[PDB]
C-alpha cells in the first residue's frame, strides 16, 4: 500500500483534501525515511512537505497521522544541522512539545525522540527547546513511583533526550534547567537498565565538563558513590561514560576530588589502568594525572592503592596517547609530592621507562618528562643522592638522550636539557 511511493505521489496525496489520502501518503513518506539505506531527506524537504507534517502533528482527531508525521519529522531531524533546521523552521518544536501529553504513549515517545534529535543538534536548538518549555512535560512523563513500570524503550528515549538537554558546552545548558533536570537524572542513574545507565552517565559527564560550579551542582547531589560503582560495571557502554564523569569531577577542587577518592574510586584503577579498550586506559591515566595534581595526602592515597606500579606500567607500554597522560601523571606527582614519595616513585622503576620516552617525536611530552626529571633531582638534592640518580639515568641511557636534547629545535627542550647536563652531569 504505502511501500516505495514516489515523492511526486506523496506530494499528490498530502495535497489532496482527503484526510485519509493524506494519512496514507504520509505513511508512505515515513517509510521512505525509514528504509535502512540512504533516505530521501533532502527530496522530502525540497518538496516542501515539512509544513504539512508539522501541521498534521496537531490533528488530535487523527492520532495515526500524528504518529506518522511525527516519525517522518523525527527522521528528517535526524540528519544534518540544516535538515534539522528545516524541521525547526517549520514550527515543529512547540508542536512536538504538545504531543508529549498525548494519550498515545507511542505518539508521546515519538515527540520525545524528535525533540531529542533537535536539541541534540547543539547549544542553540537545545536552548530553544528549553525556551519552548519542554523540560516540564518531559520530566512529568517520568514522575512515577517506580521507573520499572514504564516501557523499557519508552524510558530509554526519555533518558536519551534528557542527556541531550545536558549536552554541549558553548554555552552550557541554562543553570536552572540543569537544576530542574538533575533530581530526575539522579533517579535514572539508579535504574536497572544498562542503556538508561550509560545515557544517565553521559548526561552526568556532560554537566561535569566545565567550571567547578557546574561540577559542584552534580557532586552535591551525592552521585559520586553511584558513579564509582557504575565505574566497576561489566558493560563497556556504562564504564566509558562513567569513567568520564569521574574524570571530569577530579579536574575541580581538591575537595571535589576527595569525594571520588572517598567514594572508593581508586580501588577500580588497577583494572582500568590495564583495560583492554585503549580509550578506557587513556581516560583512566588522564584521570590519574589529575589525582596526582592534588594534595599530598591524596597522592598518598594513590601510593597506598599500589597505583604507582600501574603508572610505571602504563608509562612502560601503552598507546602513545595513554603514555603522554602517564607522563603528565608522573610529572604532576613529582611536582607536588613529598621527598619520600618521589623516592618511592623511583624505587618503583619509574626512571628507565621515563627515559625511553625521551625518544618520542612529541615536543610537549619531552618537556613534561624533562620537567619531571628536574623535579626528581630537586628532591635528590635534599637527600644528596644526586649522583646516584645521575648514574641511574646513565645506566639506562637517559643521559645519552638528555645530552642530545640540548641540540633540539625547541627552546624548553634546548634549555631544560642543557641545564640538566650542566647542573647534574658535569
Amino acid at each position: 500500500g504505502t511501500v516505495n511511493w514516489s515523492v511526486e505521489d506523496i506530494v499528490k496525496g498530502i495535497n489532496s483534501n482527503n484526510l485519509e489520502s493524506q494519512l496514507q501518503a504520509t505513511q508512505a513518506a515515513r517509510k521512505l525515511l525509514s528504509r535502512e539505506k540512504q533516505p530521501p531527506i533532502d527530496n522530502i524537504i525540497r518538496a516542501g512537505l515539512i509544513p504539512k507534517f508539522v501541521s498534521f502533528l496537531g490533528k488530535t482527531d487523527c492520532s495515526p497521522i500524528q504518529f506518522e508525521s511525527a516519525w517522518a519529522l523525527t527522521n528528517i531531524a535526524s540528519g544534518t544541522s540544516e535538515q534539522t533546521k528545516a524541521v525547526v523552521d517549520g514550527g515543529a518544536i512547540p508542536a512536538f512539545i504538545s504531543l508529549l501529553a498525548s494519550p498515545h504513549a507511542h505518539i508521546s515517545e515519538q515527540a520525545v525522540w524528535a525533540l531529542g534529535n533537535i536539541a541534540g543538534d547543539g547549544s542553540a536548538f537545545r536552548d530553544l527547546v528549553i525556551k519552548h518549555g519542554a523540560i516540564d512535560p518531559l520530566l512529568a512523563l517520568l514522575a512515577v513511583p517506580d521507573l520499572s513500570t514504564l516501557a523499557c524503550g519508552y524510558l530509554r528515549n526519555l533518558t536519551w533526550t534528557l542527556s541531550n538537554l545536558c549536552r554541549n558546552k558553548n554555552p552550557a545548558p541554562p543553570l536552572d534547567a540543569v537544576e530542574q533536570i538533575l533530581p530526575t537524572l539522579v533517579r535514572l542513574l539508579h535504574h536497572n537498565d544498562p542503556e538508561v545507565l550509560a545515557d544517565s552517565c553521559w548526561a552526568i559527564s556532560y554537566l561535569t565538563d566545565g567550571p567547578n560550579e557546574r561540577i559542584e551542582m552534580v557532586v552535591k547531589k551525592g552521585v559520586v558513590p553511584q558513579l564509582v560503582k557504575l565505574l566497576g560495571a561489566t558493560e563497556l557502554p556504562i564504564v566509558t561514560p562513567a569513567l568520564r564523569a569521574i574524570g571530569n569531577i577530579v579536574t575541580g577542587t581538591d575537595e571535589q576530588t576527595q569525594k571520588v577518592i572517598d567514594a572508593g574510586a581508586l580501588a577500580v584503577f588497577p583494572s582500568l589502568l590495564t583495560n583492554p579498550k585503549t580509550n578506557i586506559q587513556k581516560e583512566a591515566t588522564w584521570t590519574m594525572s589529575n589525582i596526582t595534581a592534588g594534595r599530598q595526602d591524596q597522592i598518598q592515597q594513590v601510593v597506598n592503592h599500589g597505583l604507582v606500579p600501574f603508572l610505571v606500567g602504563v608509562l612502560s607500554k601503552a598507546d602513545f596517547k595513554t603514555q603522554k597522560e602517564a607522563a603528565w601523571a608522573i610529572t604532576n606527582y613529582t611536582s607536588g609530592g613529598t621527598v619520600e614519595q618521589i623516592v618511592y616513585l623511583v624505587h618503583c622503576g619509574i626512571i628507565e621507562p621515563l627515559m625511553n620516552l625521551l625518544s618520542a617525536k612529541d615536543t610537549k611530552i619531552i618537556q613534561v618528562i624533562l620537567d619531571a626529571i628536574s623535579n626528581i633531582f630537586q628532591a635528590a638534592e635534599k637527600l644528596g643522592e644526586t649522583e646516584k640518580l645521575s648514574i641511574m639515568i646513565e645506566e639506562c641511557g637517559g643521559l645519552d638522550k638528555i645530552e642530545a636534547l640540548q641540540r633540539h629545535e625547541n627552546e624548553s627542550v634546548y634549555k631544560a636539557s642543557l641545564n640538566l647536563i650542566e647542573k647534574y652531569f658535569s
Partner: peptide, 7 residues
C-alpha cells in the same frame, strides 16, 4: 593549576 581539563 596543575589539574589539566584536557576536556
Amino acid at each position: 593549576p596543575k589539574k589539566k581539563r584536557k576536556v
